[PDB]
Amino acid sequence: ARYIGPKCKLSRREGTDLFLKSGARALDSKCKAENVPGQHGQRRGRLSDYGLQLREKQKVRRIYGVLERQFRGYYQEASRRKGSTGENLLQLLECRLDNVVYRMGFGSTRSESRQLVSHKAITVNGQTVNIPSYQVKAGDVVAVREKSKNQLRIAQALELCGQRGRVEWVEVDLDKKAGTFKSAPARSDLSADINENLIVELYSK
Amino acid sequence: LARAHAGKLENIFENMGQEEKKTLNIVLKADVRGSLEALQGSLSGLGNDEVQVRVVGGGVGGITESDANLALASNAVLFGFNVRADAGARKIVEAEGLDMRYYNVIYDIIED
Amino acid sequence: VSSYIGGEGHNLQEHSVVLIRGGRVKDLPGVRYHTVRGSLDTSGVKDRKQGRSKYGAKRPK
Amino acid sequence: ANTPSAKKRAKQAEKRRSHNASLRSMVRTYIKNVVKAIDAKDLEKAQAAFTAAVPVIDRMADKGIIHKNKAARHKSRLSGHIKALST
Amino acid sequence: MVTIRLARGGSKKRPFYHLTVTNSRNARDGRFVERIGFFNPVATGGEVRLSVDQERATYWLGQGAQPSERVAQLLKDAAKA
Amino acid sequence: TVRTLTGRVVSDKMDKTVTVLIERRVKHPIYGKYVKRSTKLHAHDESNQCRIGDLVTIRETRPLAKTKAWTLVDIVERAV
RNA sequence: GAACUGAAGAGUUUGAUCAUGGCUCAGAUUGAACGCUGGCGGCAGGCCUAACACAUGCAAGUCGAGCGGAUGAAGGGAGCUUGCUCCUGGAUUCAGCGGCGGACGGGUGAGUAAUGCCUAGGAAUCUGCCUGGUAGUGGGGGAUAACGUCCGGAAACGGGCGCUAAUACCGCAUACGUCCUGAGGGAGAAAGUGGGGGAUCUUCGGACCUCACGCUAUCAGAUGAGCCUAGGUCGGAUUAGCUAGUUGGUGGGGUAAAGGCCUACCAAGGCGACGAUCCGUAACUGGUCUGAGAGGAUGAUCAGUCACACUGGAACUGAGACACGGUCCAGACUCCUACGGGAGGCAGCAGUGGGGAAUAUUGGACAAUGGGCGAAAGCCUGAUCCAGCCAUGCCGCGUGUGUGAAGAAGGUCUUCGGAUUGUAAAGCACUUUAAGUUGGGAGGAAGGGCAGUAAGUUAAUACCUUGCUGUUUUGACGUUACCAACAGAAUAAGCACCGGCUAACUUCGUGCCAGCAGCCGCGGUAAUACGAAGGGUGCAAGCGUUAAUCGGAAUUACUGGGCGUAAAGCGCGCGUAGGUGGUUCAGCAAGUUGGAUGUGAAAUCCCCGGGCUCAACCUGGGAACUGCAUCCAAAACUACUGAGCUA
Ligand SMILES: [Mg+2]
Ligand SMILES: [Mg+2]
Ligand SMILES: [Mg+2]
Ligand SMILES: [Mg+2]
Ligand SMILES: [Mg+2]
Ligand SMILES: [Mg+2]
Ligand SMILES: [Mg+2]
Ligand SMILES: [Mg+2]
Ligand SMILES: [Mg+2]
Ligand SMILES: [Mg+2]
Ligand SMILES: [Mg+2]
Ligand SMILES: [Mg+2]
Ligand SMILES: [Mg+2]
Ligand SMILES: [Mg+2]
Ligand SMILES: [Mg+2]
Ligand SMILES: [Mg+2]
Ligand SMILES: [Mg+2]
Ligand SMILES: [Mg+2]
Ligand SMILES: [Mg+2]
Ligand SMILES: [Mg+2]
Ligand SMILES: [Mg+2]
Ligand SMILES: [Mg+2]
Ligand SMILES: [Mg+2]
Ligand SMILES: [Mg+2]
Ligand SMILES: [Mg+2]
Ligand SMILES: [Mg+2]
Ligand SMILES: [Mg+2]
Ligand SMILES: [Mg+2]
Ligand SMILES: [Mg+2]
Ligand SMILES: [Mg+2]
Ligand SMILES: [Mg+2]
Ligand SMILES: [Mg+2]
Ligand SMILES: [Mg+2]
Ligand SMILES: [Mg+2]
Ligand SMILES: [Mg+2]
Ligand SMILES: [Mg+2]
Ligand SMILES: [Mg+2]
Ligand SMILES: [Mg+2]
Ligand SMILES: [Mg+2]
Ligand SMILES: [Mg+2]
Ligand SMILES: [Mg+2]
Ligand SMILES: [Mg+2]
Ligand SMILES: [Mg+2]
Ligand SMILES: [Mg+2]
Ligand SMILES: [Mg+2]
Ligand SMILES: [Mg+2]
Ligand SMILES: [Mg+2]
Ligand SMILES: [Mg+2]
Ligand SMILES: [Mg+2]
Ligand SMILES: [Mg+2]
Ligand SMILES: [Mg+2]
Ligand SMILES: [Mg+2]
Ligand SMILES: [Mg+2]
Ligand SMILES: [Mg+2]
Ligand SMILES: [Mg+2]
Ligand SMILES: [Mg+2]
Ligand SMILES: [Mg+2]
Ligand SMILES: [Mg+2]
Ligand SMILES: [Mg+2]
Ligand SMILES: [Mg+2]
Ligand SMILES: [Mg+2]
Ligand SMILES: [Mg+2]
Ligand SMILES: [Mg+2]
Ligand SMILES: [Mg+2]
Ligand SMILES: [Mg+2]
Ligand SMILES: [Mg+2]
Ligand SMILES: [Mg+2]
Ligand SMILES: [Mg+2]
Ligand SMILES: [Mg+2]
Ligand SMILES: [Mg+2]
Ligand SMILES: [Mg+2]
Ligand SMILES: [Mg+2]
Ligand SMILES: [Mg+2]
Ligand SMILES: [Mg+2]
Ligand SMILES: [Mg+2]
Ligand SMILES: [Mg+2]
Ligand SMILES: [Mg+2]
Ligand SMILES: [Mg+2]
Ligand SMILES: [Mg+2]
Ligand SMILES: [Mg+2]
Ligand SMILES: [Mg+2]
Ligand SMILES: [Mg+2]
Ligand SMILES: [Mg+2]
Ligand SMILES: [Mg+2]
Ligand SMILES: [Mg+2]
Ligand SMILES: [Mg+2]
Ligand SMILES: [Mg+2]
Ligand SMILES: [Mg+2]
Ligand SMILES: [Mg+2]
Ligand SMILES: [Mg+2]
Ligand SMILES: [Mg+2]
Ligand SMILES: [Mg+2]
Ligand SMILES: [Mg+2]
Ligand SMILES: [Mg+2]
Ligand SMILES: [Mg+2]
Ligand SMILES: [Mg+2]
Ligand SMILES: [Mg+2]
Ligand SMILES: [Mg+2]
Ligand SMILES: [Mg+2]
Ligand SMILES: [Mg+2]
Ligand SMILES: [Mg+2]
Ligand SMILES: [Mg+2]
Ligand SMILES: [Mg+2]
Ligand SMILES: [Mg+2]
Ligand SMILES: [Mg+2]
Ligand SMILES: [Mg+2]
Ligand SMILES: [Mg+2]
Ligand SMILES: [Mg+2]
Ligand SMILES: [Mg+2]
Ligand SMILES: [Mg+2]
């Protein structure tokens, strides 16, 4: 399945940016993002350790739009690997095909990139892949189907990716709308406020 | 279930209005669906103002263990119209004091 | 055995075929089982709209 | 039996049983003659019976009625008994 | 007798085969004495179509093992390559 | 070559056969303490030269009677 | 270079505290069931209960190149005349004898506590078909099925009377091996078919040569099986004695083979607190699930072994059976009957009734892999490969995307200002995954038939075997996987919870009622705990409840607990089996340690990879399987042996 519905409620509940709109105008002037959603928005209501762990895990899940069972799978495979499962989890989550397409800049949001992937418009190594979970390997050359390169959405999102901060680990050729995924980003490159140790503590229980 | 509830309501109201009745409980097993309804219709007006007959369980086919122990539970007379009992039903009937009878004409059932 | 009937109303009478499940009622001494609503002859509660899966109630629609 | 091949097999089995019983009895009586001659101390009769009985034992062992180790054991034991008796 | 045949693994519509030496009166996927290779009908990519251990095959042939028709064809196919 | 066992004679009242007791130490599977187990074997002694208490050695052969499949090879210690 | 790296606590006894101690909760798992809800696909799974009873179909046949026989086309034609008759031959099919197969493959877990299973070994055995060798396959005889006749029967079919073949059966000769015997010697086999042919003799029916198949004797090898030993394998002592073919010996019998396996004598032995006997329960293992591990629980699916085939016995045939769709005897239970008389065994695949909370189609094909027969085409195959049904499980994907503030209308709350539902909706603009329609379209396929060619085969360009060439021919699944085009946002969200444990709060009804509840506990007029409504929180084609196992439980404590007062030192001695042992030398190598070799099935779990667009799934190699057994070496400690010493 997939979460469909209001997307500014999640930002208000988590209390942070949690990029879910196109980012065109702003985030503050659409949802007054300083109250928790619902009737009792003004109450502060500090929360326990379990609440903090749950909020962190839910925040990560709500940013990539992954449900609970697939998150369990990702966590299990990350723990099975070597080298600090906490950062292996983000290493794994950054290699998803929809996330890669979003980073390359062919989609306004994660959901838009997911629909680009699902609707048979993205080819990974020169053949169509429509699974928004395909782990992109380093060196793969993602592209767009020639019959769909003149869609207004990709061109519109190209400049938005132009001004959002350089990722500096993928490359893109704009004329042919074709890019290369050099390598999965290091833990430093990602936002150093997602404290994954809370996730590890929550699941190891 | 709705019909059972409504019939229970009507029976409770009638019993409250009149008094009490003595019920003869019957388990009835026939061979064909057509005979069962005729037997049930004939066994409706046979009662009186103090004693009535109630079919606690019907069915089509031979007499089994389930209806035998249902008759045991309800203290009911077991009737088989053109049907027989298998080994389990026979065992249950012989072990206890259940009385079960065979008929091929409905008027024998009416007289009994 | 003895079973407990949940919900506000019920239609059980003599010789009613019922299904029972586990679960002890703390207040009643000797009651160790629960009657499943809406399975064989219990029909479940009516006019119930919150959590109406433990009481065998269809979706109001 | 239901399949015709089973009926045919049963008929053949009865035929071969009737055939085999006579041969088994032949071997048994030829051995019994030697044994009862030995029990009676009739030496010359014992050699006569042994020489009369060895060929039929070997023949019927070859035909498959009895196994060859059985025939070898019978021959060896009878020869040993006769040799001990002669002395 | 002792025969060399194919034991089917794989999955639905995607067969995989094990070259197996068995007593003839066993289930297709039951007891065996030795496996001496495999054969992949689909193969594709980096997979190999079939592989055979020559020494074991020759040893079992010299002991009187009787290959099946498909195995008889595959053995000389492997020898040719 | 051939594997043997060594034990002590505990009964010789049968004819041309003897009973020999063999001791062994086994580690307890869970508690880890070594405990003594024993075996009582019947060995074939053709010439009746064994007495109670004799330390003897035996080897395994084909069965010679029911519950008798061992025969002794040497007497290494004689009862006082 | 990897094969692992891993361990949380909380609530509840009191006015409060610390401890002890039980109860309960948070996790992971099912062959699950039930309630509410329900779009698709891939891969698996699906009577755990009555080893209860079974209607109807199918699940084991094949060989005419072993043998008689009867059905005998096409034709050569002839005759009369266009219809028929007949001679000649003869291509097909098989009721019967005969050879193989039916002991496999498939099902179930009743019995079994040891004649089973697991680990490691050994010696006294057999083994059809297969491979390699060696010696052969000579010559005769008597029967019999089928087939004609008579009788009997409701029929099934039975009985009596004559004739005929074989690779059916039985004598005789011969023996590289084989049997026994002592060297001396004696004993024991076979079967012939099909395709060609130069020469020789003939009735070119044939003999004869060759090839292929087959048959006999024996050795070796593989495969399978039988037998033996040691260790291990659930609970109970409120089960302490058990055993007379019983334990050993001799003579004999018997078996493929050792053996009280059997028998006649001789002796009085054998087993047991290291648990015999008895009672209850139960197929075992690889494995599975939990756990940081040590452990605990457990033997669905898959693989190995065992046992069973309505109940109790028994043997025959056979290389192999005490025989799952075979025989005989007895029993219980159904059924047919013309009343005299016979038949039956779904724990094979579908299916029915019944029992149950509960578990599916009277489907397709032998196309692929195997199995039986055949020489070869080929025939059979409910094995198998595939389809049908069921959210039963695991995995994946959809139910749209962006913009959008009059912060619309409505609902809800309010301090009546407003807040919230909420960019959520509407509006505006995009896209068509999956499903729908249409057109293309692999891979699972190796082979078989025919003709020619080249080698070898002999004695021979023949037949035959093999290479190659050319032509033809094969798919249940299947409207395959997949690819492309078309219209449109259209076809597709629910369940539980919100007092603490535990993430999520306010109103309105009701008033110790109705009710809730895993544990504390709520409800008697402002209930965040009952029932609704708004809001929110978790999951999501699922969500909850019930049942069950392990964890948390260090709460049976080996790792890893205790006994003055919380449970817990026998009233006190003596002493048997057992456990443990002051201090020196010397030896031995059972324990101990190190090494080598064999084994520890495959699958599964773990690591590195390879394929299906990903994953589940499949698959290559490795690691592991912590065990057992045999050899070699060491001598500190324990054990054993000899000699000491005095704490
Ligand atoms: Mg899912
Ligand atoms: Mg409960
Ligand atoms: Mg036959
Ligand atoms: Mg012979
Ligand atoms: Mg099998
Ligand atoms: Mg099996
Ligand atoms: Mg024995
Ligand atoms: Mg406590
Ligand atoms: Mg208190
Ligand atoms: Mg329930
Ligand atoms: Mg339901
Ligand atoms: Mg429902
Ligand atoms: Mg069963
Ligand atoms: Mg049943
Ligand atoms: Mg058939
Ligand atoms: Mg032939
Ligand atoms: Mg025939
Ligand atoms: Mg058998
Ligand atoms: Mg059998
Ligand atoms: Mg078998
Ligand atoms: Mg099965
Ligand atoms: Mg069983
Ligand atoms: Mg069972
Ligand atoms: Mg017992
Ligand atoms: Mg055995
Ligand atoms: Mg074993
Ligand atoms: Mg013959
Ligand atoms: Mg002769
Ligand atoms: Mg002859
Ligand atoms: Mg066997
Ligand atoms: Mg044993
Ligand atoms: Mg015991
Ligand atoms: Mg005696
Ligand atoms: Mg003896
Ligand atoms: Mg003897
Ligand atoms: Mg004896
Ligand atoms: Mg005992
Ligand atoms: Mg049992
Ligand atoms: Mg633990
Ligand atoms: Mg474990
Ligand atoms: Mg584990
Ligand atoms: Mg067990
Ligand atoms: Mg099974
Ligand atoms: Mg097996
Ligand atoms: Mg075994
Ligand atoms: Mg087996
Ligand atoms: Mg065995
Ligand atoms: Mg068996
Ligand atoms: Mg059966
Ligand atoms: Mg049955
Ligand atoms: Mg029987
Ligand atoms: Mg018999
Ligand atoms: Mg007989
Ligand atoms: Mg025999
Ligand atoms: Mg058997
Ligand atoms: Mg059989
Ligand atoms: Mg049987
Ligand atoms: Mg069997
Ligand atoms: Mg059967
Ligand atoms: Mg019989
Ligand atoms: Mg009888
Ligand atoms: Mg009977
Ligand atoms: Mg049956
Ligand atoms: Mg069945
Ligand atoms: Mg069964
Ligand atoms: Mg049923
Ligand atoms: Mg039922
Ligand atoms: Mg069901
Ligand atoms: Mg089934
Ligand atoms: Mg086939
Ligand atoms: Mg034919
Ligand atoms: Mg069929
Ligand atoms: Mg499905
Ligand atoms: Mg359900
Ligand atoms: Mg299911
Ligand atoms: Mg308003
Ligand atoms: Mg489509
Ligand atoms: Mg093809
Ligand atoms: Mg099409
Ligand atoms: Mg809270
Ligand atoms: Mg509630
Ligand atoms: Mg109130
Ligand atoms: Mg609550
Ligand atoms: Mg409430
Ligand atoms: Mg529920
Ligand atoms: Mg539960
Ligand atoms: Mg439980
Ligand atoms: Mg539970
Ligand atoms: Mg514990
Ligand atoms: Mg517990
Ligand atoms: Mg602990
Ligand atoms: Mg301790
Ligand atoms: Mg304690
Ligand atoms: Mg103490
Ligand atoms: Mg006290
Ligand atoms: Mg004391
Ligand atoms: Mg004291
Ligand atoms: Mg005392
Ligand atoms: Mg005492
Ligand atoms: Mg005392
Ligand atoms: Mg006292
Ligand atoms: Mg003392
Ligand atoms: Mg002592
Ligand atoms: Mg000492
Ligand atoms: Mg000592
Ligand atoms: Mg010393
Ligand atoms: Mg060692
Ligand atoms: Mg293994
Ligand atoms: Mg891959
Ligand atoms: Mg030394």
Curated annotation (Swiss-Prot), chain B:
Protein location: Cytoplasm
Family: Belongs to the TRAFAC class translation factor GTPase superfamily. Classic translation factor GTPase family. IF-2 subfamily.
Role description: One of the essential components for the initiation of protein synthesis. Protects formylmethionyl-tRNA from spontaneous hydrolysis and promotes its binding to the 30S ribosomal subunits. Also involved in the hydrolysis of GTP during the formation of the 70S ribosomal complex.
Protein name: Translation initiation factor IF-2
Lineage: Bacteria, Pseudomonadati, Pseudomonadota, Gammaproteobacteria, Pseudomonadales
From Swiss-Prot, chain D:
Biased composition (Basic residues): 6-19
Disulfide bond sites: none
GO cellular component, one term: cytosol
Protein name per its UniProtKB record: Small ribosomal subunit protein bS20
GO MF annotation: an example: structural constituent of ribosome
Key word rRNA-binding present: yes
Family affiliation: Belongs to the bacterial ribosomal protein bS20 family.
Source domain of life: Bacteria
Residue numbers spanned by region Disordered: 1-22
PANTHER family (alphabetical): 30S RIBOSOMAL PROTEIN S20, SMALL RIBOSOMAL SUBUNIT PROTEIN BS20C
Signal peptide boundaries: none
NCBIfam families associated with the record: S20
UniProt GO BP: translation
Keyword vocabulary terms for this entry: Ribonucleoprotein, Ribosomal protein, RNA-binding, rRNA-binding
Chain's role: Binds directly to 16S ribosomal RNA.
Swiss-Prot record, chain E:
GO terms of biological process kind: translation
Source species, domain of life: Bacteria
Database matches in Pfam families: Ribosomal_S16
Molecular-function GO terms, alphabetical: structural constituent of ribosome
Disulfide bonds: none
GO annotations of cellular component type: cytoplasm; small ribosomal subunit
Keywords: Ribonucleoprotein, Ribosomal protein
Family classification: Belongs to the bacterial ribosomal protein bS16 family.
Protein name in the entry: Small ribosomal subunit protein bS16
Organism: Pseudomonas aeruginosa (strain ATCC 15692 / DSM 22644 / CIP 104116 / JCM 14847 / LMG 12228 / 1C / PRS 101 / PAO1)
The gene coding this protein: rpsP
Swiss-Prot record, chain F:
InterPro entries hit by this protein: NA-bd_OB-fold, Ribosomal_uS17, Ribosomal_uS17_bact/chlr
UniProt xrefs under HAMAP family: Ribosomal_uS17_B
GO CC terms in record: cytosolic small ribosomal subunit
NCBIfam families: PRK05610.1 (NF004123), uS17_bact (TIGR03635)
Family of this protein: Belongs to the universal ribosomal protein uS17 family.
Subunit structure: Part of the 30S ribosomal subunit.
A GO MF label: structural constituent of ribosome
Coiled coil: none
Gene that encodes the chain: rpsQ
Name of the protein described by the UniProt record: Small ribosomal subunit protein uS17
Keyword vocabulary terms for this entry: Ribonucleoprotein, Ribosomal protein, RNA-binding, rRNA-binding
Function comment: One of the primary rRNA binding proteins, it binds specifically to the 5'-end of 16S ribosomal RNA.
Lineage of source species: Bacteria, Pseudomonadati, Pseudomonadota, Gammaproteobacteria, Pseudomonadales
